[PDB]
Structure formats: C-alpha cells, structure tokens
Subunit: 133 residues, 4 copies
C-alpha cells in the first residue's frame, strides 16, 4: 500500500466508526480495509435487538469488499478503531474471518481514540488457526 | 427502478459470492429510498457459523455507507433454488430491524420464478 | 407432562442465564417425545454476535445427548416481556430444522401470558 | 481435576463426537468439558441448512454446562477432537466463548483420531483477547 499510510487508514477507520449502528451496546467500532489495487472499504458494527445477529466492523468491511468482487488474498491492510484503553482487540469471530479472507499475512493496524497503535497480522492474532481444506 | 432491474442487480451480485463449502452462490440487491443500489453476496467460512448471507451483506454495506434503518425501499434475493429462494431466519431478523416490517422483499431463482413479500410477512410476531 | 410443568421448567432454566450485557434473562425447556426435559438459557458474550439464545441452548444440549431432529414434542420459552416472548429469527431457523415444522412452541412471560404456536407457523416458507 | 486424566477427557470428547449432527460438512467434532466439581459435559457440532446457524462442539458443551447452572470460571478443562492431521484447532468464535466462559487459564486439550495431542490454554489460543468491562 505505497500510497496508503497507517495514519490515513486509521483516519478512514474513524470515519467508518461514525456510521455505526450500535444502540444496544452504545459501543461504536470502525474499520477500514485497503485492497491490492488501493480501494478503501469502510466497515462498522451493526447491531440487532437479538444480540446474536450483531455484526462487527471488521466483518462488515470484508463482506462489503467481497460483494464488490474482491477475493480472499486481495487485501493489503485493515485498520480497526474503538473507544478502548489500548489498541482495540478484534474479537475471535473477526479473527477467523480475517484469516480466511485476508490470509495469515494480512496487516492489521489496531488503534483507539487516544493515539495508541499496534501493528500485527491476522496470523499472529489467531495462532494455529482452524482451516477446512 | 423496475423489479426486473433489481433482480438483474441481484444476479450480478451473486456472481461475486464466496461459497467454496456449499458451492451455492446467493446474490442480493438492496435499493434505498433515494435510489442507491447495494450488492450483497454470501461469504462463507471454514467455521460454518461465521458464514454471512447475501441479504445481510447488502444491508451491512448500506449501513456502513451511512444509511439508517427504514431508509430502504426493497431487496431482491436470488439463488439456484427450485422455486423463489427462501431467506433464512437470521436474515429475516436483520431485515426486519434494518428494513422495517414494510420492506419489500423480492424473492427469485435462476429460472424466472418470482414471489414478492415483506420483511414483516416473513417474520410474524417478530422480536 | 402438562404445559404448566413445561413452563415451570422454562422458568427454572431462565434463572441460570448468563446475560450481563442485556441484563435480560431467557429460559427454555424442551421436552422430547420420550419425555426427557432439557433446560436452556441465553449465554451472552462481549462479542455480541456470539450470544446464544435459550431455545438454541436447549436444542443443542438435546442433540449432544444423542437425540436426533424430529424427536421432540414441545419447547417452552420465557422472559420478562410485555406479552409472550417472541423467538428471534435465528432460533426459528434452528427450531424448524431440529424440531420440524410441527414442533409445538409454547411462548410465555413472567406475568402468565401464553401463546401456543408451531415452528412452521413462526417461519413461513422456510429455507 | 485430580480424578480426570487427559486420556479420560479425550475419551469423553470422542464419545461426544459420535453424536454430532453434521450432514452438511460431514465433519464431526466432539468436546468434553469438566467442571470444578468434576462433572463432565459433552458437546458436538450441530449444523443447519443455513450454515451461519451451525454451532461448534466446544460451544455446545459450554452452553450445556451454563444451562446446568455452571458459571464463568467454573471449568477445569475442555478436550476437543476431530478427524484432523494435527490436534484439532478451535475456531476463533469458539476461542472467544472459551475465554469469556472459561477464563484465560482454562486448560484446553486438543487432539485428533490418531493420538496426536497438544495442551494449551484459552488465553494462549486468543492472545490479547477482546473484552467488554
Ligand atoms: Zn468482532
Ligand atoms: Zn440468510
Ligand atoms: Zn433467539
Ligand atoms: Zn468453533
């Protein structure tokens, strides 16, 4: 992502977060996903009165990109942001989807609303991940 | 926008599906009240419970773009089913909250069979 | 087994719920055709999409014990709702597959309001 | 779990696996959970024609124990088994539920149908896990 800095991707993730639908938790999360050809996809959490139907920002971004014709392995990086003490931690469900759609080498930029950043990978977030060949 | 145009959009959406486990591609096309179209496709996962449906993919995308619950006109859904495709209960629960009971739902298949219903009709006495 | 007894079992099940996020406890009691009762409660998670409902907890438990789809007589569901509690679309999708459309569903609240329905009625033209 | 060996817990997980409802994947998984007072709960995967409603063995076992009145932190160990090359890897969704219900220190015994075993913890499976305080 020669033309996409971590700062720019975090800024897009914060912009994504503003569109969240989270009236149940009141906990807004944003994600921004940048593809192999430099296209950026926003994701936010989208809640439901039946909590089990809630969808996370990371997954919203990835599903949106897939719907646009991007395929597993076509993503350069994803940034995720929430109002947390440290850089936001993706949930396990998001990690499983990130590893399948982004591959273990997907760069994951985690941040909060206070300038705290850590850079990791989908593989590092989910060691010895489950696969079905 | 015609129902035919929306169905065609859903068919186009379907082509972009990721369904290596079921080998069963589904498409959806959601139109907003102001005329914007959002494509949705099913996106599967090795952990089956993490699979996402076309209808939900389209709705989540529209929310991510800044649309709010109740700002949608209709959704078309298509797969290679015998009759018009039947949305699963999970999709129905999401459609009713984000689309409202009055959301028009256009169900179809790859053979031209069509049924029109609403989010409310699909999920009687909803949560 | 009486409907009253099944409802009381669902109330007992409800007490064991893990719902610190919604603070809203739900119970279910599933009775098999040979008369065994399985309790279910909702079990929430910090990642909301991973929350499991009472209805599903009871059905999954019965499957894990060795019961097969279609081997169930009825399920009761209870929460502190205004009228009888309404099962979500996700539960309806699971109930129709594991219980079959003819599965009797007894919906109730903490005030004595009851409605009896079926898995098929709750999910018209199911997937 | 003084009276429950890893071997005994694995044997219970294999017995659990036999009861799986997996006509879609044809991939049966079993789990066995042992509580603080030595009670054992079986779990198996339970599939649905709409794949997003499938439930995993690990989660089936934990939800069953919760329904019996066991609470977060009341679990000593969980064994998980499937027909895999190495010890079966729990999916990310299961890891998120295991960490909340079992706590980071929950002992996780992973195995297959060919005698391969590894012992880990819920925390090790899900580093820097997501929580809501
Ligand atoms: Zn997540
Ligand atoms: Zn669906
Ligand atoms: Zn439910
Ligand atoms: Zn799992």
């Amino acid at each position: 992502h020669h033309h996409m800095t971590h700062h720019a991707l975090i800024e897009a993730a914060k912009a994504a977060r503003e569109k969240a639908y989270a009236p149940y938790s009141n906990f807004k999360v944003g994600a921004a996903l940048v593809t192999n050809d430099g296209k950026v996809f926003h994701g936010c959490n989208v809640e439901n009165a039946s909590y089990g139907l809630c969808n996370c920002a990371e997954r919203t971004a990835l599903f949106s990109a897939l719907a646009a014709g991007y395929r597993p392995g076509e993503f350069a990086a994803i940034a995720v942001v929430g109002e947390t003490h440290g850089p936001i931690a993706p949930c396990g469900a998001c990690r499983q989807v990130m590893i399948e759609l982004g591959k273990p080498t997907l760069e994951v930029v985690l941040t909060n609303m206070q300038g705290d950043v850590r850079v990791t990978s989908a593989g590092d977030l989910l060691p010895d991940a489950f696969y079905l060949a």
